Amino acid sequence: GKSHGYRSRTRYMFQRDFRKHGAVHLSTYLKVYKVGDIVDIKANGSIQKGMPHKFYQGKTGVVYNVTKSSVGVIINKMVGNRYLEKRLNLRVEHIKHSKCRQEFLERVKANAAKRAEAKAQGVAVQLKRQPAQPRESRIVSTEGNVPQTLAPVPYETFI
């Protein structure tokens, strides 16, 4: 018959990695999570308690509950034609903070600093990001850079 267990098809997903097996380092236990933090989920195969299901591997969610050794995380799961709210109790070995959130907060504080310093002059702050604009005019010189002519190479076996 068919087989769809709780950890089916999780072979390479829950292998550890090359040459970093063994016990886990103490930074994962010393990291501090608060309610509202945004965290990434990546399971550790060395810890069998508080494991996430294989669906939530690589998923990103929001902390809603902090307990003794675990964290409650909220994920949005697509079921059919809508997203449902899923609450997960995961031990802290299987989560880490999302770095995109702290990058955005750094952008917020630097952006507020720019607005605050330029508010003393009113110099059209222009605080929105802009994407890659087309590159403008330039003059390239041939002083020591005379062009070298290239041609297609004929065919050879090369074995």
Binding site: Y64, N65, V66, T67, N76, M78, G80, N81, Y83
Partner: protein, 58 residues
């Protein structure tokens, strides 16, 4: 009389007809599943805060 077993054909079209609405998020989400020792203190903290604000703006 064998028949077709399973397919996922047309399913994403059916979903994306009037489909993939994100759930409505709210200020003050539900406190169910939150730790009872936290909620038991949170009730008294909000009660004291409401009493202090009522006495301030009475």
């Amino acid at each position: 009389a064998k028949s077709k077993n399973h397919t996922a054909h047309n399913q994403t079209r059916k979903a994306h007809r009037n489909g993939i609405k994100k759930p409505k998020t709210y200020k003050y989400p539900s406190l169910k599943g939150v730790d009872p020792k936290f909620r038991r203190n949170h009730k008294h903290a909000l009660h004291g805060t409401a009493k202090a604000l009522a006495a301030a703006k009475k």
